[PDB]
Amino acid sequence: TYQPAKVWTWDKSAGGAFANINRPVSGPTHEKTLPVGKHPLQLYSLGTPNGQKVTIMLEELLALGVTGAEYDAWLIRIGDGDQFSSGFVEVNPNSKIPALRDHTHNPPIRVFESGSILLYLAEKFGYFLPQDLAKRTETMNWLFWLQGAAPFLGGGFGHFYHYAPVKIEYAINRFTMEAKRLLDVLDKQLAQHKFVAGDEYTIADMAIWPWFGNVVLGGVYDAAEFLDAGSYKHVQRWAKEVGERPAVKRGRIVNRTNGPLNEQLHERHDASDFETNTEDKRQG
Amino acid sequence: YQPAKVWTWDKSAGGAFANINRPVSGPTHEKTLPVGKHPLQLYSLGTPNGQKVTIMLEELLALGVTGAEYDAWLIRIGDGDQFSSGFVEVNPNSKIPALRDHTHNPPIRVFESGSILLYLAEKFGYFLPQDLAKRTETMNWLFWLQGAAPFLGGGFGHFYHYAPVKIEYAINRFTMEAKRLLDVLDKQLAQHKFVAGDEYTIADMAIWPWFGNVVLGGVYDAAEFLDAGSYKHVQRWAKEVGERPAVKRGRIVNRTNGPLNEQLHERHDASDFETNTEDKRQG
Numbered sequence A: 001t002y003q004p005a006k007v008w009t010w011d012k013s014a015g016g017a018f019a020n021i022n023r024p025v026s027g028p029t030h031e032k033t034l035p036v037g038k039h040p041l042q043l044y045s046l047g048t049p050n051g052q053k054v055t056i057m058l059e060e061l062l063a064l065g066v067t068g069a070e071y072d073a074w075l076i077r078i079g080d081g082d083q084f085s086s087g088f089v090e091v092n093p094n095s096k097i098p099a100l101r102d103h104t105h106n107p108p109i110r111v112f113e114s115g116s117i118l119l120y121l122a123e124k125f126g127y128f129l130p131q132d133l134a135k136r137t138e139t140m141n142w143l144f145w146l147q148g149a150a151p152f153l154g155g156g157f158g159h160f161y162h163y164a165p166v167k168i169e170y171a172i173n174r175f176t177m178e179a180k181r182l183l184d185v186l187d188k189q190l191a192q193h194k195f196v197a198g199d200e201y202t203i204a205d206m207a208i209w210p211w212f213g214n215v216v217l218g219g220v221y222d223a224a225e226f227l228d229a230g231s232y233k234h235v236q237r238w239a240k241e242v243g244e245r246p247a248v249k250r251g252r253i254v255n256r257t258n259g260p261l262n263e264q265l266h267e268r269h270d271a272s273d274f275e276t277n278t279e280d281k282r283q284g
Numbered sequence B: 001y002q003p004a005k006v007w008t009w010d011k012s013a014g015g016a017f018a019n020i021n022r023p024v025s026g027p028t029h030e031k032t033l034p035v036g037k038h039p040l041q042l043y044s045l046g047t048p049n050g051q052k053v054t055i056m057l058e059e060l061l062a063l064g065v066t067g068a069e070y071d072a073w074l075i076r077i078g079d080g081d082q083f084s085s086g087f088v089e090v091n092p093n094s095k096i097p098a099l100r101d102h103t104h105n106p107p108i109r110v111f112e113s114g115s116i117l118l119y120l121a122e123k124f125g126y127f128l129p130q131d132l133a134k135r136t137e138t139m140n141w142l143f144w145l146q147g148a149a150p151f152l153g154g155g156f157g158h159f160y161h162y163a164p165v166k167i168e169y170a171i172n173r174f175t176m177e178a179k180r181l182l183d184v185l186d187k188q189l190a191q192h193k194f195v196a197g198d199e200y201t202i203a204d205m206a207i208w209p210w211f212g213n214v215v216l217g218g219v220y221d222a223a224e225f226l227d228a229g230s231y232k233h234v235q236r237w238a239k240e241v242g243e244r245p246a247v248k249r250g251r252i253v254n255r256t257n258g259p260l261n262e263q264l265h266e267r268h269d270a271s272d273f274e275t276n277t278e279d280k281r282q283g
């Protein structure tokens, strides 16, 4: 019967999902400077649920004509360890996407953590975060909630249900029960409010949709049936409402490398890229 | 064992926190929350997440910010107090800490410890830099904490410490990550006195009760396992922050175990630290 050691040590031979990238130590593995484009915002990211939050926000800002939200979204393949380049570590020492630099300052200001990037963009431009203190505070409560909940959905439920090479009943049960509890909190909130934090769409919706909205629409971990996604009537209503917004349809495909080819735009350097550079146009 | 097509909730599970954990949210009983005389009403327990907030409130009072006066009411999460109707009304997620600011009508509810730290920093104007670069870097680390603690607590703490059955696969996954996060923090503190820069902020208050106390042996009985003495900069900073007068006080609010002089079950007036700690209630 297994007993932990007095002092944990790393077995590099264990293998398994993300074996090639996960380590007990942080920092750079190689020297590479990040590319920088002509736009004021430089984003270094991948179209996972956390990258999508940020590119949905950027697209929503552009739809309101916000010229300062123009951006270059450079692809960082986390499977290849691009997050451990010297250049990437300088923008985010935690080596996770998304990471952004705002080049309208000197020196440029780095922003890492998807939730921090959403708050930074909301404050910078003044949209998608209410002015009223009570409404702003509710919006922040739900944004934080997501930032504290996604780790359970991804690092817990998604890991054990989808990626782990061994199906562990105790861990699947613990993390599926919690993912359901979180969906239930979200469902009972959306029963009473059009959007997560109230009557208006905010950065809280943008943070939550790529995780909880996509999970119930079948888009993450092949888990909608296992999670009984159809039982969360109000999550479904809201996930379809937010998912149909034109800026969400564009934001959700930026830096995306899975799904239908016509729903992948591997980098974004101008608005016209959506017309000409999606992966369905690059098959020859 | 193979997962089902659709997960169903069995009982017969009696593992750690199995008696409070459910796949559904909402109240288990009806009870109103107590309300005291002070402007800020806190409903919490002195776990790492409660301590973030009581530290901030004590730091603000140390600066003479009288509007941070607070009632810190005890919520016993092991008794299901987080599932009363009154508690669900302040935080529909049923976790502590949760706070209401009764200087508004209706009072403004604030839930998630990181949301509370931000709300208080913005309300009073302390512990969140005004310079945009420094402000942004403080928020990066605060959000980093809020996204990292789930792995330290609901992963590492759960599988290493609380679960009586030690599941090697899970313990290796979450220990590795705990150490990676410690190393991030150590490499940052190698270059900076506080987590976000030169000055103490809400980011230190968020991170200390988790990563600071883990390295000092205060959480999960894990310092040896984690090789915590290897993170020299986390140790330096953890000791430096722990010496702060307001940290010494904040860390004991709503604590219900440990030495008697390190337990103040509720805080309802500043003199409670002199009169009403569990050691002083000894007759």
Ligand SMILES: N[C@@H](CCC(=O)N[C@@H](CS)C(=O)NCC(=O)O)C(=O)O
Pocket: A021, A022, A048, A049, A050, A051, A078, A083, A095, A096, A097, A098, A112, A113, A114, A115, A147, B144, B147, B148
């Ligand atoms: N708390 C984070 C989590 C970010 C995150 O988990 N990014 C993942 C991809 S979605 C990643 O970069 N993983 C790289 C790795 O684990 O090495 C945030 O909200 O930004």
Ligand SMILES: N[C@@H](CCC(=O)N[C@@H](CS)C(=O)NCC(=O)O)C(=O)O
Pocket: A145, A148, A149, B020, B021, B047, B048, B049, B050, B077, B082, B094, B095, B096, B097, B111, B112, B113, B114, B146
């Ligand atoms: N993301 C959270 C987590 C809060 C949390 O995990 N609270 C725990 C105590 S430290 C809790 O109330 N647990 C009660 C339960 O799980 O039923 C926050 O930062 O406030």
Ligand SMILES: N[C@H](CCC(=O)N[C@@H](CS)C(=O)NCC(=O)O)C(=O)O
Pocket: A017, A018, A022, A048, A049, A050, A147, A150, A151, A152, A153, A154, A155, A156, A158, A159, B147
């Ligand atoms: N270090 C990895 C990389 C995979 C990954 O980073 N997953 C992301 C989603 S793409 C995640 O669970 N993020 C948690 C969060 O968003 O807080 C792992 O072993 O789980």
Ligand SMILES: N[C@H](CCC(=O)N[C@@H](CS)C(=O)NCC(=O)O)C(=O)O
Pocket: A148, B016, B017, B021, B047, B048, B049, B146, B149, B150, B151, B152, B153, B154, B155, B157, B158
């Ligand atoms: N629902 C429980 C209760 C235990 C609990 O709430 N743990 C807190 C620490 S006291 C936690 O890990 N919080 C995670 C966070 O702060 O994000 C669990 O099964 O993990």
